[PDB]
Amino acid sequence: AMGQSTSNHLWLLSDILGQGATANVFRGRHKKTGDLFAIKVFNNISFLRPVDVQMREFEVLKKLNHKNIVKLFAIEEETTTRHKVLIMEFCPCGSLYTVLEEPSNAYGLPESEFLIVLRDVVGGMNHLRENGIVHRDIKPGNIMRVIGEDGQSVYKLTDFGAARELGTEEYLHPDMYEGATVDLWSIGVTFYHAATGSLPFRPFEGPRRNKEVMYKIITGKPSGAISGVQKAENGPIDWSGDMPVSCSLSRGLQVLLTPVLANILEADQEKCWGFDQFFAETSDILHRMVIHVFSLQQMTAHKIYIHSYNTATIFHELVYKQTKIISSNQELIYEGRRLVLEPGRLAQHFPKTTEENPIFVVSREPLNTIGLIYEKISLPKVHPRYDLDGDASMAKAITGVVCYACRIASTLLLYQELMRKGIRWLIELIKDDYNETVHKKTEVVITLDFCIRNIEKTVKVYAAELGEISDIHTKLLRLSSSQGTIETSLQDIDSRLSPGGSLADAWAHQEGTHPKDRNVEKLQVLLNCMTEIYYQFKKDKAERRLAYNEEQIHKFDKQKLYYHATKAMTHFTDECVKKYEAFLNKSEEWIRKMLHLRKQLLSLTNQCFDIEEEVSKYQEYTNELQET
Amino acid sequence: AMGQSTSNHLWLLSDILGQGATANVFRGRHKKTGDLFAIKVFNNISFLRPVDVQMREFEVLKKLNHKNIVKLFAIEEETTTRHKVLIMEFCPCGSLYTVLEEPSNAYGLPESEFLIVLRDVVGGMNHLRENGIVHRDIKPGNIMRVIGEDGQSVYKLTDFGAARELGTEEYLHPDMYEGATVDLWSIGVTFYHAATGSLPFRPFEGPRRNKEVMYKIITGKPSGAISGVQKAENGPIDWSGDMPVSCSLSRGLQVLLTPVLANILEADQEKCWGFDQFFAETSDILHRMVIHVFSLQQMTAHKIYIHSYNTATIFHELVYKQTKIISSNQELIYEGRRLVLEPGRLAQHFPKTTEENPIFVVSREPLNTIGLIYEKISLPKVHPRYDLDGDASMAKAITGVVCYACRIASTLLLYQELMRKGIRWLIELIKDDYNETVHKKTEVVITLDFCIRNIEKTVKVYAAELGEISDIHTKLLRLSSSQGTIETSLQDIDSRLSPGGSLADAWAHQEGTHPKDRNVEKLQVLLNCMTEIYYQFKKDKAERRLAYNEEQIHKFDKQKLYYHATKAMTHFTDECVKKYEAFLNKSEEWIRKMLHLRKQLLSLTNQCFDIEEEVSKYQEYTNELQET
C-alpha cells in the first residue's frame, strides 16, 4: 500500500524496525542497487530544523566509522513530506533486546555470547568517549546485532547524540532519575540484564505508579549490592551482591564480573569508577583466556580465567579459590595420561582444552562430591483469560523455564559422560602406577636373589664366620619375607584393578543417563513446539485483536503450551534428574574405594623404597670384605 | 477466502500439500479440537462411486496401523460438494522429496538419515506386503517425514491402493514402462536417489520427448550396473556399478548397498530378488553396528559395518578390505593408549566410538598417505535470463555445489584435528615403549654389574684359573661394551622424542587449518544467504509471475547468488584446500621419520633380549661351580 520514498531510497510503512519520538526506522532499499538499508525518518521536525548545525553534525557522524557502531551512510530528503532521512546499515538480527526476547536467554545469555556483548559494548562506548560524545541512554533496545563473516555475532550502537537540541526508566541513574557516573549505571543495568536475563532492581508490581518503591531501591544503594527485589506487594527487598543460581555464566567469570558491576552501580561518585577504571578492569577480563577444568572429587566443571603470560602458580591459586584444593594437592590429567606442569610455565603453551575435553583434577585429600548446583524452577500458573498480552508474557515465561530445564539436563549429561571418561583414564593411570611398582619390585627381586645367593654360596665353599653368615641369612630373610607379603598384596590390588574387581567402572556405564537416551533431544522437540507457539503469541499481541478462528486457535495452542511444558518437566525430573542423582550417589562410593586403594598402593610402593636402601647396606657388606 | 469444510473438519483451499489425479491433500483442522490433520478430498468421483466396495475397503485401511505408514483416522463427506474426504495424519516436515529439494542433500542424504530412510521404507513396505497389497508407485514424493519424540526422523507411506478401480515415469519398471519385480525397481531408484541425490538413469536432455534414450537405457540393463548417464546430446551412456565420488555415504556402507541395488534393478526376474531376499539382505545391513576407524597411514577415516555377535577376526578382515592392511599388521589405539583385542572378542563389548573419536590404526609396513578423496565440482554458469523456473533450478544447483564444498571443508578440518591427536597419542605411546626398554635395560644392567663384580672379585681373593677368568672377563666386556652403545643410541632416540627433536608434532600444530580459523562458519554464512535466496526463488516460481519491484529484486539477488558462491569457492580453495594439502605433504614426512625411529627402537629393544639370554649362560657358570 502506502510507502515513503527518497531520491535514492524507498520503503514501505508496513516495514517497521523501531519507533522513536523524533524519528522512526523502516526497512528500506536503494532504488538503484536494491541493497537493504535502515531508514531513519524524523517525525515532528519543524520548531527545530537547524539545517546549519545539523548539516556539519550529520557530516561528522557520517565519517565516524567503527565495528561496534551502526554505520551512517547518507543524509537525504523525503520526496513528498521533505523530511530528513538518515541511512543506517540494516541489522537483520535486530537488537540485544530481541536476543533477550528469546526463551533460551530468559535466564541469561550463553557465556561466550556474553563475552561478545561485553567486548563490543565496551569497544563502541570507548570509541564514543574518545570523540567526547556521551550517551547515557544505552539499552539492549538500541544495541544492534549483526552476524560477522566468521559467523560470530557483532554488536553495534546506533541511537545517540539526540540530547543536544532536546536514559530508559529502568536504566536511569538515581540522581538523574528525578558526572560520567550516569553512563556506567545504564551499562551496568544492561550487563546484569544480559547475564541474568532480568533487571537488577525489581519491585513486586513493576515499573508503574507503584514504582515508588523502585526509586527507594535505587536510592537505597547498600554497599556493593548489585541487585534488589521485593518478592511480595509492598514487602522487604531481597538484596544480593552476587549473581543468581540460574545464571548460565561460569563461576570464574562471576568472580570477575561481580566487582565490576558493584563499583559502577551507585549514586556516589566517591566509590564509583571512571571510564578509565572501567575500561581497565573490563579489558583485563577480555584479555584473559579460558581454562576448562573438571574436578572429579566434587564432580564439578570449572572455567578459570587467566592471562596468557601468567604462571602455573597463579593457576593453582585460582583453582584453589574455586575447588578448595591445595596447590600441592592439585593433580592434572589430560587425554588418558597425567601431565606434570612446571611452576613457571606460561599459559600460552598449555594443551588444547574444551569444556567437553577439559583438564581433570584428582586430589590426595578426601573431598565431598557436590555435582551440578542449579536453581530448581517450576512452571507458572496458566490463566484461562484470553489476554493477548498475558498469553505472550506467560508464553515467554513458561518456555524460558523449560529452556532452563533442558539446559541443565544437557549439563547433567555432560557431567556423566565426562565422569565416565575421567574414571576410565584414572583406573588405567593408577594401573600404570602399579606397572612401575612391579618394575621397582623386580629391581629389588634381582638384587635379593643374587645377593642372598652369594651369601648362601660362600658358606658352601672356602664360630666367627658362622655367626656372621647366620646374622646375614636372617637379615636377608627379614626382607625377603616382607617382599612376599607385598608381592601377594599387590596381586590383590591388581585383582581390584581387574574387570569386576569392585573398582570397575561398570557401575558408571549403567546407573546414569547416556546420549543414547536422547533425553535432551526429547525435551527440545517439546521446546520447539512451545517456542513456535510463543513467537505466534507475539504475532497475535501486535494485532491487538484476532478473528474468531484465530481466537480459538490461540486458545487451543495455549492449552497445548501447558501440556507440552508439563510433559517435558515430568520427563526431566523422572528420568534425567533421578538417574543423575543415582549416578552421583554411586559416584561417592567408587571415590571412597578408589582413594582407599590409592592409599594402599602408595604405602606398598614406598615400602619397596624402604627395603631398597636396606639391600644397599647388605649387598656391599660381605661381598666387599677387605684383605691384602 | 473460499474454503471447504466437513461435519468435523474444515480447511482453506489456499493450504495445499499435494495435488493428485483422483484426490487432493489440504492442511485442515478438526472443528472441535483444532488439531491439524491431512485432508484428502477426492476430485472427479462420479463414474465410479462404489460406496459398497470402498466402504469396507476404507474401513480396512482404517484399522491398519503402523509406525512407517501414514495413519488414516476417518472417512467423512464434504458439506456442499458431498465429496468423500479421508482424514490422514498431518506431516509438517513434508515428504522425502522435500528433503531432496534441500541443497544440503543435493549430493545425497547424510549417512545416518539414509539409514533411517532405508529402515523405515523397508518396514512400511514389508507391512504392506504382509497384507498382500502391492504399491509399485513408491516415490520420495509419497514418502512422508515426521519428527519422532526422540528427535529422529520417521518416514511413512501414504499414497497407495488406488490401482484397484482405475509408478512414476522415472521410477517405472522396463517391462511396465510401455511379477513383484516392479516393486523393487522403484524402491531401488528411490534408494539411489537418496544416496546420490540424483536419478540412476539420466539422458542428457531429460524426461521429455527425447526420453527415447531413457527407455534404451532401462532396457539396456548391462550386468549389475546401478546407473547410466549420457553426458552429451545423443551420446554414449556412462555406466557404473558403483556409487559416485560425491556420495556422502561411508565406503563400508557403499560396499553393502551396491549389491542390493544391483540385484533389484533389472528387467529379468531370473537374477532379480524376491521380497524375502530383499528383506533379508537389507535387514542384515540395518542390524549391523558402526565401527569408526581412522587410519593414520593413509589419513583416511573408515566406517566398518559388523554384527554385534561377530569376532575381531572378521573385524580385521573387513578393515583389511578397506585399508589394505594385513590383520597381523593392524594395530589399534584408543584414548591415548594402545588397546589389545582378543581374536574372539564380541563387538558388543567394544569401547565407545564416534567419528570424531574413532579407533586409530598404525601399521609396521610402509603405506602411502591418501587423505580425503572427493569429487571436485565447480560452479555452473549463471544466465541473465529472467526465467523463474531456470532461476530456481540454478539456485538449487549452485547452492548444492557450495554445500558440498562446505561439507568437504568440514571433513578436511576433521581429518587435521584427528591427525594432531593421533600423532600426539602415538609419540607418547612409543615413548612408553622407550620407557619399558629402559626398564629391561636396567634389568640387564643390574645383572651385568653384580655378575661381573663377582668374577672380578674372585680373582682378588681365594694358569688354569687365570685362563678361565680372562675368558669370562672378555665375554663380560663383549656385552657391556655393546650395552654402552645401545645406552647412548637410546638417548638419541629420547632426543628425537623430546620437543624439537625432529619428531615433534609442532609442524602439525602449524601447517594445517584449525577450528580457530572458523572457515566452515565463514562458508556457512554465505551458504545461508544463498539458501535464503534459493527458497525465495522457489516461492517466486509458484507465482509464475512477479510485480515490477519483485522482478528486479529477483534479479538483484540472483546476481548476489553468484557473488556469494564465488566468494565461498575462492575461500575454499585458497584457504581450506591449499593449507590441507600442505598439512598432508608434511604428513608424509613425519610418517617416514616416525616409522624409521620405530624400526630403530624395535631393533635396539630386541638386542636387549638378545643379550638377556647371554648373561643367563654366564651368571650361572662360575658362580655355580661344583665341589663336594
Ligand SMILES: O=C(NCCCNc1nc(Nc2cccc(NC(=O)N3CCCC3)c2)ncc1I)c1cccs1
Ligand atoms: O535507531 C533507533 N533504534 C534502534 C532500533 C531500530 N534501529 C535499527 N534497527 C535495525 N534492524 C532491526 C531491528 C530491530 C528489530 C528487527 N526485526 C525484528 O525483530 N522485528 C521487526 C518487526 C517486528 C519484529 C530488525 N537496523 C538498524 C537500525 I538503526 C531509533 C529508532 C527511532 C529513534 S532511534
Ligand SMILES: O=C(NCCCNc1nc(Nc2cccc(NC(=O)N3CCCC3)c2)ncc1I)c1cccs1
Ligand atoms: O497423499 C498424497 N500425496 C502425498 C503428499 C501429500 N499428502 C500428505 N502431505 C502431508 N504434509 C506435507 C506434505 C508435503 C509438503 C508439505 N509442506 C511443504 O513443503 N509445502 C506445501 C506448500 C508448499 C510447500 C506438508 N501430510 C500428509 C499427507 I497424506 C496424495 C495427494 C493427492 C493424491 S495422493
